[PDB]
Amino acid sequence: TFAKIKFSAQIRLETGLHIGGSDAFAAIGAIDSPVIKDPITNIPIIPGSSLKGKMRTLLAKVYNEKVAEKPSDDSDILSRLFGNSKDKRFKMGRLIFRDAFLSNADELDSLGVRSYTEVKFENTIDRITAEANPRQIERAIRNSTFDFELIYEITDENENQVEEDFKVIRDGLKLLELDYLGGSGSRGYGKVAFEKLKATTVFGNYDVKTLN
Amino acid sequence: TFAKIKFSAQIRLETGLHIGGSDAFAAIGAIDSPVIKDPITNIPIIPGSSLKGKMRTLLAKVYNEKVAEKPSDDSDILSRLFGNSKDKRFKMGRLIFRDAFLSNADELDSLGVRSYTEVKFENTIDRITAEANPRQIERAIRNSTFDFELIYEITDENENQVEEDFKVIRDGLKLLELDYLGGSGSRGYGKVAFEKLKATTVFGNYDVKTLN
Amino acid sequence: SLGVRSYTEVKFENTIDRITAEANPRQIERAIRNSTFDFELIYEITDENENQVEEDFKVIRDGLKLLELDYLGGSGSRGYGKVAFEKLKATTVFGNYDVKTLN
Amino acid sequence: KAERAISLLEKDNKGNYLLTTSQIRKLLSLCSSLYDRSKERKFDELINDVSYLRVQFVYQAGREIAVKDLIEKAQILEALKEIKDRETLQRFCRYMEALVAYFKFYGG
Amino acid sequence: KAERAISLLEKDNKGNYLLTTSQIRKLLSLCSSLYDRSKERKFDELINDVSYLRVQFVYQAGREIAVKDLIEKAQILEALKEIKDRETLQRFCRYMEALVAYFKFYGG
Amino acid sequence: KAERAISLLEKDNKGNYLLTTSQIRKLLSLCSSLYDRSKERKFDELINDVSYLRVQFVYQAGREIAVKDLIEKAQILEALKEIKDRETLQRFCRYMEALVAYFKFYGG
RNA sequence: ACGGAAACUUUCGUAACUGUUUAAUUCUGUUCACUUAUUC
Secondary structure, eight states: OEEEEEEEEEEEOOOOOOOBOOOOOTTTTTTSBBBBOOOOSOOBOOOSSSHHHHHHHHTTTOOOOOOSSTTSSSOOHHHHHHHSSSSSSSOOSSSEEBBBBBBBTTTTTGGGSSSSSEEEEOOESSSSSSEOOEEEEEOOOOOOOOOEEEEEEOOSSSTHHHHHHHHHHHHHHHHHTSSSSSSSGGGGGGOOOOEEEOEEEEEEOSSSOOOO | OOOEEEEEEEEEEEEEEOOSSSOSSOOOOOOSSOOOOSSSSSOBBOOSSSHHHHHHHHHTTTSSSOOOOTTTTTTTHHHHHHOOOSSSSOOOOOOEOOOOOOHHHHHHHHHHOSEEEEEEEBBBBBBBSBBOOOOOEEESSSSOOOEEEEEEOOOOOOOOHHHHHHHHHHHHHHHHTTTTOSGGGGGGGOOEEEEOOOOOOOOOOOOOOOOO | OOOOOBBBBOEEEEEEOOSSSOEEEEOOOOBBBSSOOOOOOOOOSSSSTTTTTTHHHHHHHHHHHHTSSOOOSSSGGGOOOOOOOOSOOOSSSSOOOOOOOOO | OOOOTTTTTOOOOOOOOOOEEEEEEEEHHHHHHHHHOOOHHHHHHTTHHHHHHHHHHHHTTTTTHHHHHHHHHHTHHHHHHHOHHHHHHHHHHHHHHHHHHHHHHHOO | OOOTTTTTTTOOOOSSSOOOOTTTTTTHTTTTHHHHHHHHHHHTTHHHHHHHHHHHHHHHTTTTTHHHHHHHHHHHHHHHOOOOOOHHHHHHHHHHHHHHHHHHHHHO | OOOOTTTTTTTTSSSSOOOOOOOOTTTHHHHHHHHHHHTEEEOTTTHHHHHHHHHHHHHHHTTHHHHHHHHHTTTHHHHHHHOOSSSHHHHHHHHHHHHHHHHHHHOO
């Protein structure tokens, strides 16, 4: 009738990504937009807005029946999973994400690191001169786990399609690992890896069997 | 006969949320709806209207016996806890809420922060062009306690259902922690955490035993 | 010179029958705040008023300060009256009794 | 305060304001974070925020040409030294909000 | 006063008033917070509220096109400079309320 | 802190600052990595980062002439010994950001 | 040695019950720390 499904997993970053954050003032050694972090502390965290904005785009191009043009108006078979501000049949979303926080600080200092992020030097060639525009970016360190929990809930009507809902969610998790997750990741910056993909119930109403 | 139950707790925000406050004039660096605060001072506070409007909605979809359509006219077993403008048996509510004020300012200045809220940069992709509509929002900082006290009182008739009343209230507190509390929480902005959930008596009439 | 509304305002009041919501949406008409008035209490003796004049001022002076601690009007149980005698002075017109018990 | 802010801001050089309201979304928020805290506590406690607030103006005058021409004309660095009282500090916060209103009145 | 406010407001451009009474819920309320304070104290004390009240009109003339066409026609910035007395300041508060009633009669 | 940083940095020798903002992109990030970690934990735990931070000013002063002339004048090595408390360590982090803003104010 | 004398429009009563500024949205699309170079 009403259950709570939480997809608890650990996102293992095998390659340092780069997501444009707010004000470019996290360090006095940069010149471009670094990575958004925590306003109170200073731990490299990834928001949840980049997860829904990337997973929905890469999934609506294989499970669709019409050429897209504008968001929230393509492929009705997956519009009920995210949300639609135009359809009168549903308005709220049944897939609540969460801002993943870096929880690898309990054993990172024991190995002896420099800080939490690094500055990578890059440039470009105009095919007429040597080095031009000596810019720089600030990526993330390697091996940094996170806390990703996908909250799922039914609303009574979710009856003759529960088995089909898990097929789209499970296929979307393995599809994100084969693509970059960030900004300007065409050169090889993103590529996540969901470690320990498990799902448990907290409210206690739906049995667990389709774990993997 | 007549007791006063106060559910004193501390709401710990584990994720920065975003609730559309009043006019967009709390800062000269925004462009959209910020977060409601204090008219005299300047401390980020959350009103009590968002707590009653969200806890009642998420609870009336599991403890009901008929498909709802309009507010204050669904599931009579929980209508007496909030109120009803149509039933002649009761009119006033027995669950008086309270606007939670941020009381974490006693130790926040010792750590040295920038302000009290941050400006997060977001945009959208039309799947035909690059960046479009460079908008911006204003979320809340992490780790900020609040003063949440749920005032409860009986009216003599509350006799053979007191034990059932605490079951619905306790189930609604743990259910709010598994869902966003605010606006645009589909990407992972809400998700509160009731820390130190305790209940005491001020008037002195009903014994305490069902603390947890 | 200050620019106000008019002279009398309208206040919305109702009642609760403890069984329904709003009952009898009536209204009243109160008076504005800060409005001075001209109050003159005339006192005259009649020859016999001789060995009790000093006692008469004790009752009048006590009655003036007692009215300030009580409502003066209708439905004053919620706090509508409560006057304040400003510049309490006494003078003579005919001139036959000296002034000394001013306050 | 508001009378001398309508003629000094207009007197510039090349037309078409290249500086937008997006690249100045920090120095305009730090001044608002000090006016609200001056009414709660005293002035002798916020001595660390005043020193950090002055560095932000000098740091912006070296990374963009649209900042040096605004500080030397409006005398931003001069007003940061005359302040010393709680009432005087509140005047500088209101003067900064006036330059933002008249900036978008002619362009954007 | 009330004669030139019935013909100047009607003379506009494109029909259907896009600006509603919801996006102007600040500049119309701050002027009411000065009329009640001008009758209690003197005019030489409220010199800080007059400077801040003028900034609200200029700040809105750059964020919406429905404001520039109203200030230049009704001469809002011109009336804010002629005022200097307590009796003259009270006239500007009554002139602003006249432009709101006729704005909702023809449209909304 | 900020008052003595505007006159000591200007007093140099030969004009045209040869040292750019690109060759100093390490010592400015190491000091920023200590101010944020000092507010989370205690000072007795970060005793290894302070010793490693002092060596960076010695190695950089033996490979470029544009480093020794700045340490001896600004007294960088002297401030690294007076610090001993968490509040005192936070003052040295804010003083380093002041020398960067005024460095690009006159040149770049 | 007044068509006068003696006298509260007073006593009673929340403008009340009900209601998330909410649904939708990657700060990303292009970019070798490069060019000339006997540890002889």
